RNA sequence: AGAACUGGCGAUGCGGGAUGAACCGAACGUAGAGUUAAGGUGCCGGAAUACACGCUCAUCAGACACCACAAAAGGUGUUAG
RNA sequence: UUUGCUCCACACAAUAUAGAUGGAUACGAAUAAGGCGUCCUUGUGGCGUCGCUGAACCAUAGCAGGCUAGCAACGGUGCACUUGGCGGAAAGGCCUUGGGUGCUUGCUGGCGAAUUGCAAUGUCAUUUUGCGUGGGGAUAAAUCAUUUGUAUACGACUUAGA
């Protein structure tokens, strides 16, 4: 669609005769639209137990927003999927601009180094790193300093124009 | 709007300088580059080399007539480069090289007029920081070039030239430039310099 | 001014092939200053006739009459498809065309 | 004896760095980093404009030779109030930097009719130009 | 991990500065005055105080990342090569028969013609590079002074001259009279 | 190699995968305009060198399996757990 | 062989078109990078300015750019000559000095506009050649036949011949 954002997506099974109230499963499912997200709800959840699948109700589907899209941290998501040689139980301390805008970045390299399908990539709990010491990115905290000044190469010159005395060149 | 456009070789690529000229030369556009000796590639002068072990088939494999379909003289000739763009099949590309007239080095004249270039032909706009350099004047010498030292010493011949003139050239446009801040104190920048004058 | 004209001098691509499938009634007109398709709503609706003569003194000279119209936008280097009567060629085309700023919407 | 660099020293970006927007809807409103994510994208941010932060590639910024003494911090609107206090903006239409863009965006709103009697406002100081290129 | 920055502190004593533009370096000192070419690298220097040099290299995830270090050893080159200089004290340890080796001149270019090399008629004009001064012996039997003021144009003709007389069946145990390096020492004594 | 059912070819085109009587879409009325999927967007060839996020240095480069399949054992070319 | 052909000037008519409607505007080199101005002991120098593409400079005011005068001038631009330079890759151009004519909208008058009936690719441009006046300059070749035979299937190159 656009961009996987966050839902809230509650089950209750069967509050009835049967079993009055079970335990009330919810997570943190993050998608685009409230479609895939309700498919993967029942995918990260496999350890349900013999009642029905029929009963694929929710209990209040709604929309949960980007906590504070401009605090820009380090947090930790367990990367998780299963290919044709195995597993992968991974983790990355990326640097992240949000709280959801890391599994965006994810699609983009995980599909880039080891070939990550689709329809395996697990979603697990979202770490937060605020602190130091617990740190074992190397190449985050060089990244992260007070007053650092460097130089950049490369420029953009969009053009389609046959015509030019500026003679082209790149300096940022 | 202009009815020949001549771009420079400045600091130019290959098949990347014929970019937008493909839409020109169909359009019936005289394009022609200058310079070929001045002809700079992102690349390297390693890979390129081995232009004869694989350049052969589908003609007569020795004849002078009906044989070999050109690509012979340093590589094969820039010229052939440029007709792979373009749909030489037709009558469309036929009349094309009719207004092509791409030579080699210096040609007629068109180089002392308009040198416009295009934003994607410069390797300058396409270089990685760490890229090895590459130089179509080795690389001809590297096949045994003929004229190698007269080539090099007619273009030095017009570099000084052209120092000459250009300082005559930025004489008289110096005092039009000293009497353009000095002669703004009348009524001339006192009303334009809130509209774009 | 030495000089009189109130049409474009856009640079026309070429006509209504398709494919594998030929049926030129729409043309390709290329106007240059434009790179956005938002800016090619001004040029909407205008006689464009090409540019060509005859040979007989049939109307004056050489002048025969052609005509043809702006249509909807194409592309996105706001390319204009201004289709013609019926004078629809394939002679390899591609030029200056005469299009003419406006029939004024404003 | 001294070693002597030439020059090729670009404009260095660092924490507190006024910049520019000239691709997006945001385009031709004046901005600033403030606080330095990493060595990619960015965090721009526009002063007098009202807008909130966002994910900008370097493609569509670019850094101004104008400096400042602002902290680090992804906000807006506290870069505002406290504006007086490290003022550039009035060098900004002072300096020959962006006049020219300006140059062509007030032009491009002049009517025709502002447009034509020019040429006599050009011509008051051509005559002294003539007079002075081969006499002087 | 793609490195921002490798800043190295460089110690230049004055007198023998360089001079910094685009990535060209100048050598500057009292015996002999070269210059260098340097377009594969891409190198940028700067000064902050004089005798160190605080910059910023980008990319440390290839080949790049410290290219600060294989340029420093070439500074370190041609700061001790105009000062303290590199005196190749190469022996010549050989017996079989009294070789007459008689260097003559020829453009400036001083062809080393080797008249009678055990047993062999053929003169070898062996190319010798300005910047380098080569005598003979005048105390210690055989000897040959290799003085120059630069590394690829002592250094690298060195290794030319000395696998010059390269045989498909002899090599080296057929007789004593290898040319080898005894010690790779520098001009200056005292440095 | 030998059965039941079986979307086509056989007996059916046009478009498209460079090219294909066997695959996908579409079980064929005659113009124009508009709207999908498959197939695309430098030219050849009717189409934006339009944008953001990764990675690489090969004197056998690479860009659609079926369709003249390659595997195991290595290495001081590099990135991310 | 019914005095023709070439160069400058070009009456009245044809054969054209790969698309004319301000204008094809000369520094070179480099991109972990430059140009211009000023200063200086003239260099790998320093200071200042410019850069984020041609949306910048030049050019533009009269019937398809008409017919006059005055003021502001001793500039600028175009056609037709002469003197003084330069050029060897398809050179076939550029600049300067010394005269005359038309024009010269910075500012300031008068006359002219239409009847064409709101536009009709609404012409004042050019590839090549031939046929009528003549002001200059210049007074020619090849093939067949025959002869010589280095050449020779029928041809061509090398023959002789006032």
């Known amino acids: 669609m656009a961009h996987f954002k966050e839902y809230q997506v509650i089950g209750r099974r069967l509050p009835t005769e049967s079993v009055p109230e079970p335990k009330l499963f919810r997570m943190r499912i993050f998608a685009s639209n409230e479609v895939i997200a309700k498919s993967r709800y029942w995918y990260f959840l496999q350890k349900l137990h ?24 380090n947090f930790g998501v367990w990367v998780r999927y299963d290919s044709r040689s195995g ?9 992240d601009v949000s709280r959801v805008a890391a599994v965006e970045t994810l699609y983009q390299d995980m599909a880039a180094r080891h070939r990550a399908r689709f329809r395996s990539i697990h979603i697990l709990k979202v770490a937060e790193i605020e602190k130091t010491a617990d740190v074992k990115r190397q190449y985050v905290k060089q990244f992260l300093t007070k007053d650092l000044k460097f130089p950049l190469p490369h420029r953009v010159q969009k053009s389609t124009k046959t015509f030019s005395y500026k003679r082209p060149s790149t300096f940022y | 709007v202009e009815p020949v456009v001549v771009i420079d070789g400045k600091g130019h690529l290959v098949g990347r300088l014929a970019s937008v000229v493909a839409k020109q030369l169909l359009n019936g556009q005289k394009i022609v580059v200058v310079r070929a000796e001045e002809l700079n590639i992102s690349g390297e002068f390693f890979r390129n080399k081995l232009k004869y072990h694989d350049f052969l088939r589908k003609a007569t494999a020795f004849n002078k007539t009906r044989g070999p379909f050109h690509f012979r003289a340093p590589s094969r000739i820039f010229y052939k480069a440029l007709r792979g763009m373009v749909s030489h099949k037709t009558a469309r590309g036929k009349a094309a090289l009719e207004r092509l007239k791409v030579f080699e080095g210096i040609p007629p004249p068109y180089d002392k007029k308009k040198r ?24 001809s010498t590297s096949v045994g070039w003929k004229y190698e030292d007269v080539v090099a010493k007619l273009e030095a011949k017009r570099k000084v030239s052209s120092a000459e003139y250009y300082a005559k050239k930025r004489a008289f446009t110096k005092k039009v430039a000293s009497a353009n801040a000095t002669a703004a104190e009348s009524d001339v920048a006192k009303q334009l310099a809130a509209l774009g004058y | 001014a030495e000089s009189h004209r109130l049409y474009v001098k856009g640079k026309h691509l070429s006509y209504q092939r398709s494919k594998r499938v030929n049926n030129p009634n729409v043309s390709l007109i290329k106007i240059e200053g434009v790179a956005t398709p938002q800016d090619a709503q001004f040029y909407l609706g205008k006689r464009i006739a090409y540019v060509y003569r005859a040979s007989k003194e049939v109307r004056g000279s050489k002048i025969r009459v052609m005509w043809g119209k702006v249509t909807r936008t194409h592309g996105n280097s706001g390319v204009v498809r201004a289709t013609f009567r019926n004078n629809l060629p394939a002679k390899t085309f591609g030029a200056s065309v005469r299009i003419f700023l406006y029939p004024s919407n404003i | ?23 997006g809807q945001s385009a031709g409103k004046l901005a600033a980093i403030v606080e330095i994510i990493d060595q990619k994208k960015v965090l721009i941010d526009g002063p007098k404009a009202g807008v909130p932060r966002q994910a900008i590639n370097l493609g569509q910024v670019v850094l101004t030779p104008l400096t400042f003494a602002l902290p680090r911090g992804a906000r807006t609107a ?21 006049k020219k863009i300006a140059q062509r965006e007030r032009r491009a709103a002049l009517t025709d009719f502002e447009r034509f009697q020019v040429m006599v406002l050009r011509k008051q100081k051509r005559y002294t130009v003539k007079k002075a290129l081969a006499k002087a | 991990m793609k490195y921002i920055q490798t800043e190295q502190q460089i110690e230049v004593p004055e007198g023998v500065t360089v001079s910094i533009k685009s990535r060209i370096v100048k050598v500057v000192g009292p015996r002999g005055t070269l210059t260098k070419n340097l377009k594969h690298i891409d190198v940028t220097f700067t000064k902050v105080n004089n005798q160190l040099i605080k910059v910023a290299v980008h990319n440390g995830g290839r080949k790049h990342v410290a290219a600060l270090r294989t340029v420093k050893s070439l500074v370190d080159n041609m700061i001790t090569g105009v000062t303290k200089g590199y005196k190749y004290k190469m022996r010549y340890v050989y017996a079989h028969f009294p070789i007459n080796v008689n260097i003559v001149e020829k453009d400036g270019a001083k062809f080393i013609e080797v008249r009678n090399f055990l047993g062999d008629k053929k003169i070898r004009n062996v190319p010798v590079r300005d910047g380098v001064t080569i005598e003979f012996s005048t105390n210690v039997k055989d000897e040959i002074v290799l003085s120059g003021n630069s590394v690829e144009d002592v250094s690298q003709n060195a290794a030319d001259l000395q696998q010059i007389c390269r045989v498909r069946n002899k090599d080296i145990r057929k007789f004593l009279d290898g040319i080898y390096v005894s010690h790779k020492g520098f001009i200056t004594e005292d440095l």
């Open chain 4, 1 to 23: 004896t001294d070693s002597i660099v030439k020059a090729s020293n670009w404009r260095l970006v660092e924490v507190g760095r006024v910049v520019l927007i000239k691709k």
């Open chain 4, 78 to 98: 506290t870069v505002s109030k406290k504006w007086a206090a490290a003022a550039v903006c009035e060098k900004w239409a002072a300096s020959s930097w962006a």
């Open chain 1, 50 to 73: 013999k009642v029905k699948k029929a009963s694929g109700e929710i209990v209040s589907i709604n929309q949960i927003n980007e906590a504070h899209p401009t605090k820009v941290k």
């Open chain 2, 116 to 139: 416009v270039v295009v934003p994607q032909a410069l390797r300058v706009l396409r270089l990685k920081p760490g890229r090895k350099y590459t130089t179509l004047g080795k690389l």
């Open chain 1, 87 to 95: 597993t992968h139980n991974m983790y990355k301390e990326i640097r």
